[PDB]
């Protein structure tokens, strides 16, 4: 699930609504600390409206119990975040199939037509000769993540 814990209060009477545009800034970390995302770095905060379901599982639950002004510590297991990885999302391409500039490289993410006629995202993992491999499954699936979330406004 998500666990919450206070870094320092909000108001405590100002809580998000279902439908409502929440106001953030965050910094995100992986269980050993390792910085992975942050909105105070991009200088901009992230917003998202309550149900949704535009953020994981873990924000939804966790940002509904803070209110307005607080800053709080959301660890969130991976079932509540982006999922556990799957062997079936990592599958293996010719070279043929790589037509971007250049060669393949490690990391570059390749986008390929999925079965609903959108455009999904794969990262090439390994390059063996001819054979590139590519995995599908969300980059920080299996890892549990801890977010510091501070819930600045709400708005319409």
Known sequence: GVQVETISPGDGRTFPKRGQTAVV????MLEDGKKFDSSRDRNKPFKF???KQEVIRGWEEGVAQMSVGQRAKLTISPDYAYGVPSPDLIQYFSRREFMDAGEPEI?????FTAMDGSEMPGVIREING???TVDFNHPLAGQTLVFDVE???LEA
């Open 107 to 111: 990391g570059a993410i390749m986008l």
């Open 151 to 153: 819930l600045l406004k």
């Open 25 to 28: 800034h965050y910094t995100g």
């Open 49 to 51: 409206m309550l149900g």
């Open 130 to 132: 001819d054979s590139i």
